Design a protein around this ligand. Structure first.
Ligand SMILES: Nc1ncnc2c1ncn2[C@@H]1O[C@H](COP(=O)(O)OP(=O)(O)OP(=O)(O)O)[C@@H](O)[C@H]1O
Ligand SMILES: Nc1ncnc2c1ncn2[C@@H]1O[C@H](COP(=O)(O)OP(=O)(O)OP(=O)(O)O)[C@@H](O)[C@H]1O
Ligand SMILES: Nc1ncnc2c1ncn2[C@@H]1O[C@H](COP(=O)(O)OP(=O)(O)OP(=O)(O)O)[C@@H](O)[C@H]1O
Ligand SMILES: Nc1ncnc2c1ncn2[C@@H]1O[C@H](COP(=O)(O)OP(=O)(O)OP(=O)(O)O)[C@@H](O)[C@H]1O
Ligand SMILES: Nc1ncnc2c1ncn2[C@@H]1O[C@H](COP(=O)(O)OP(=O)(O)O)[C@@H](O)[C@H]1O
Ligand SMILES: Nc1ncnc2c1ncn2[C@@H]1O[C@H](COP(=O)(O)OP(=O)(O)O)[C@@H](O)[C@H]1O
Ligand SMILES: O=P(O)(O)OC[C@H]1O[C@](O)(COP(=O)(O)O)[C@@H](O)[C@@H]1O
Ligand SMILES: O=P(O)(O)OC[C@H]1O[C@](O)(COP(=O)(O)O)[C@@H](O)[C@@H]1O
Ligand SMILES: O=P(O)(O)OC[C@H]1O[C@](O)(CO)[C@@H](O)[C@@H]1O
Ligand SMILES: O=P(O)(O)OC[C@H]1O[C@](O)(CO)[C@@H](O)[C@@H]1O
Ligand SMILES: [Mg+2]
Ligand SMILES: [Mg+2]
Ligand SMILES: [Mg+2]
Ligand SMILES: [Mg+2]
Lengths: 309, 307, 309, 309
């Protein structure tokens, strides 16, 4: 198995709290917050750790919030490679409402990155050995030119680094502008915006995913479909995997759990079939847990065994 | 064989649109659009749309009742109506533009006298041996559960093949009678039926099969919404999953699935064919208020799933 | 006192139901609907009868829903003068959610009126004696052009019918364009649209209201200010009245109750001060009741006595 | 003019953000948060500084959030007297929703205060000279017994310090029990619990406020009435002041700004009528903007002049 790295240009220090009910204007009394690491690439790294793997997380850490994010990851035994940033690491809030059992997720933008901090992140990335995997996951923070992300990807590929991409909107289209991306996981909306057309016909999602592969932007496209599982295509095969009929408790963490699992499989030279199935197992395993908990090893394995009969 | 359906609690469905939803203020709504509604009625509508013929049996009361009959007449749906004193209920479906979501305000079904129920019970027993009867929708005020189950038992004794898609208690009671041709519980209904949480990947299959192996029903199709359906009989097991297409209104989606599945059951099709056609029609019925599944959309989704 | 009449071009059969929860997509099981009369002019007439006066409600009624509306008014002993119409009277839905105590008001468009049916309504209005009061209140049904509403008001004023107007938007604006209205009650939002400018400075509401008076558009302008009561102006005087510090249960009906009370006082040749105080008394009394219930006599009198000390 | 101090046992670093709509489950995209000092007595001191007076804020401060609080207060030229606490200053999140215009307020528990940290706060308070004014405002931190805050008030009064209390529930009751409070500003619910009965009649709020004054518990009672302004009484006079009809936005710190303006007038030995007017002006000025910006000098002055006509 090759070494695995993740990149998070917009990291997060997530906080979670509980309150009896939700209504405007009044003071909603919340419990003492519980802190957790957050961010696309970061959670991929955490998910991979839960599955018995190892992934080093590269990200900017700013201020006291940045320190805490670093500290929590250290407790979680997740290796980290950081860059001191000036703009303090953002802090998001997750609210559980007792009366309804519903959750509310307020997501602030990532802290800004200057040219300096972005340069150092690129230097960290280009220290990765040839043949290793790099997962770039999450939103693009302010202060980062769309051209810079593209140049970083082009540079990594240039020295034999294998790139996996999970983003949205403009940054996603930028990452695929280069091409030769080993794997991307768009959801249905993300795929829709990418090819800039509504996917109304039954075979539209597959045709859109195949077009991406056929044009050489990505070797593998796994379109994640929420409760419907996923549809994966490369230059030869197509696989569709549906989760087991078990009720979802909380969809939070599903997308990153699926990316982490599929990353591990790519690392072990897995077939497309095993990659997607293990991807759906982890993503669905994450939804069995309340709140923000990512996939656990046992739930994932249990679902994977079921899908792989 | 011939198909009939039975709706004890019909509804004149009304659909409207509003910009957004919030309390206290006046929420301006558009001019409502009226459509036929109610479980067995929608089933019969679906079957007509799919090229088959099913006679819908139900009570109609007042001007809402006439409105409902007039709409079904325009859809060439054979009706066997019983005149009732209490007016046919009127349900309101509000589509919110800022969310794309739908809110469903569902009034109680119209009351049913002993005499009116008697007339319906006489219509049902005028069904010949070999035909199929689809009992669908909730139980209206004035109707004893035991009166429904005696109706099933009586129907059974004269060769009427019964399909039941109703309330929680009606589902349980119909299964106690046993030999039900087809039931379509969703996940919550299956769980409430067998009195346990379905937590393992295979729990839904195990509970559905358990129902078939115990003789309570011949076929169990567990409806999964977005994930399609999982069907079992005494021999085979199949899950069919819908295409990745966004849903609008899902009202009557279960009913369309039941209609399509009944249709294939009436053609003596295979379990795999029945479930596939079921999910095809069920999802086609989510592409628009209470319009249900069209012939073209169902055929297209079907041809897709059947690849 | 003189005779009092109201005009509701868009009447309503209001149905009220109760449901335990509110959420999308599900079947929200609702109780069998209770019915009551709806429409602006109709509610003005109902509030007047509660306050000891007597007002005849003029409106179209169509089909079984129309008859249902007429029957409900008779059960409350409010006199009516109806015109039969082909298009059935609309039906609105009021939903009270038990889990939260919130209420939701789904308002359908008014029923259509053809030429002959509107010509009958106009005939009814023009049979009102000179010196008598007519309150025009509520929205405009489709099919009725503003030019027709203004021609109706103009004709009425020609034979000395004293017109009071409560509307919004183009309807209110066109009515004031005719001029010589005895009284208008815009709320803050409705005043702003009239003058076509944001009212942001402390004295803006008073200035805008006075403008309407000085221009001749209306002899009296009472701007209702929700919990803050009201500010009324005529050619000579300005008065502001705040409701007493008692909690409101439900503010629906407050508008029509106020207009009801101020109409009664105008009919009794009351001073501006008495009229505004009574209007706030009735409007605020309505808020003491749950749901859609209008002002009661005893509550109004209690508040009015307090204000008039 | 005597010196003014405030005491905030449970300070807050307020954060304010903006999101288009509010719904469960999904990631809600929010704008970058804006930070400002929060907590009852802290907002009182800030409002005073905005209005051209000077008040010294006494409070505990902990961690990086405590440092952020202090720094933000220097920017606003509010003099402070802080005690270092081990538990970090809390951080509350206020979320404004665009499509509704409403605000959601998630309020974390106040930071812990041990015996030694509270002792430091008390020693800082008892350094205040005789004749000076102390404002005690805001919730009680978990781990602080009422008897401690109560003993602090009595000790304070023994050495001539003039105490003003703005609290709720047991704290306000306990404070009033000691008696001789210069001023209290309960809202309507707060007042009802003090006198332990429902305020259902028009004159109930006034009677209730007068009973407290007459008993000698407080020398002045000002019942704040939200949009309806405030009703103030002392041993001789009584006045209700209603604000101008201006659009209100965020209400956070409205009560504190009111308490601040009234504390100034009490220090200038002003009359009841000036005091209540200035308070309504400040409180209403504090509602024109989003977040916790409080009242500005020019807005308060322009409103105050209007009210004094
Ligand atoms: N409601 C659900 N029920 C069962 N499995 C689910 C559900 N939602 C998501 N999953 C599983 O998790 C995987 C990923 O979810 P999804 O398609 O929503 O990705 P995503 O939109 O990128 O997630 P995220 O918003 O966290 O980034 C799905 O393919 C599926 O396997
Ligand atoms: N977009 C919205 N989201 C949430 N609440 C709203 C919204 N618009 C209005 N409201 C609510 O409406 C109530 C009062 O204002 P509103 O204009 O709705 O009352 P109204 O009497 O029905 O209006 P009007 O009298 O002008 O017809 C308030 O509770 C306010 O919160
Ligand atoms: N929250 C309240 N508390 C006390 N009194 C109120 C309240 N809201 C309204 N009122 C009383 O009702 C009167 C009219 O209400 P409002 O200013 O909202 O008019 P309106 O918006 O046209 O009413 P409506 O929306 O019902 O048509 C007010 O002047 C006041 O007397
Ligand atoms: N305009 C809206 N009104 C109400 N709910 C909405 C709206 N938009 C999104 N939602 C909610 O979002 C949920 C779906 O997931 P959604 O895509 O919105 O979040 P997400 O998974 O964080 O997005 P993404 O994965 O693309 O980052 C729906 O269940 C729905 O409740
Ligand atoms: N959100 C959806 N997306 C796609 N297909 C759907 C959706 N909801 C329902 N369907 C189709 O309709 C069928 C019945 O829907 P379901 O919600 O299970 O019925 P019920 O009303 O009994 O819960 C499903 O099996 C599926 O084929
Ligand atoms: N909606 C509003 N409109 C105008 N002024 C307001 C509004 N809400 C508050 N204020 C001003 O702020 C002061 C205090 O507000 P209030 O809600 O009574 O405080 P509290 O938060 O203690 O309940 C009020 O007396 C008033 O001057
Ligand atoms: O039969 P119920 O449970 O009383 O509800 C009646 C409603 O259900 C329908 O029959 C069908 O909708 P569903 O597919 O959600 O069950 C509507 O047409 C009708 O308004
Ligand atoms: O002191 P509490 O009751 O814990 O509340 C603290 C919050 O209240 C504020 O002091 C504002 O006061 P109000 O909402 O009572 O006007 C905020 O600054 C702070 O976030
Ligand atoms: O990187 P984005 O898209 O801004 O999302 C950040 C949020 O998403 C998460 O990674 C979970 O989806 C959280 O850790 C974090 O709060
Ligand atoms: O806003 P519209 O179209 O005039 O409808 C009137 C509605 O408002 C009410 O007057 C409530 O004040 C009801 O009588 C009626 O349901
Ligand atoms: Mg994702
Ligand atoms: Mg169903
Ligand atoms: Mg009004
Ligand atoms: Mg307060």
């Amino acid at each position: 198995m090759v070494r695995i790295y993740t990149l998070t240009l917009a990291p997060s220090l997530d906080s979670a709290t509980i309150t009896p009910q939700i209504y405007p204007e009044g003071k909603l009394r919340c419990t003492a917050p519980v802190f957790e690491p957050g961010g696309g690439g970061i959670n991929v790294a955490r998910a991979i750790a839960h599955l018995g793997g190892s992934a080093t997380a590269i990200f900017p850490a700013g201020g006291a919030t940045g320190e805490h994010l670093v500290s929590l990851l250290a407790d979680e035994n997740v290796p980290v490679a950081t860059v001191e940033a000036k703009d303090w690491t953002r802090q998001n809030l997750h609210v559980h409402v007792e009366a309804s059992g519903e959750q509310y997720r307020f997501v602030m933008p990532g802290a800004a990155l200057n040219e300096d901090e972005f340069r150092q992140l690129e230097e960290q990335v280009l220290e990765i050995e040839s043949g290793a995997i790099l997962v770039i996951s999450g939103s693009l923070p302010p202060g980062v030119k769309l051209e810079k992300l593209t140049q970083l990807i082009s540079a990594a590929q240039k020295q034999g680094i294998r790139c996996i991409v999970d983003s949205s909107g403009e940054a996603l289209s930028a990452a695929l502008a280069i091409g030769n991306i080993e794997l991307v996981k768009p959801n249905q909306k993300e795929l829709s915006a990418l090819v800039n057309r509504e996917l109304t016909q039954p075979d539209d999602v597959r045709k859109a995913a195949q077009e991406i592969v056929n044009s050489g932007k990505a070797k593998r496209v796994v379109v994640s479909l929420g409760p419907q599982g996923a549809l994966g295509v490369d230059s030869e095969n197509c696989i569709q995997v549906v989760p087991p009929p078990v009720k979802s408790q909380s969809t939070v963490g599903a997308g990153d759990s699926m990316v982490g699992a599929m990353t591990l499989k790519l690392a072990e030279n897995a077939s497309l079939e095993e990659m997607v199935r293990f991807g759906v197992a982890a993503g669905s395993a994450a939804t069995l847990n309340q709140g923000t908990r990512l996939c656990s090893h046992d739930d994932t394995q249990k679902i994977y065994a079921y899908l792989s009969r």
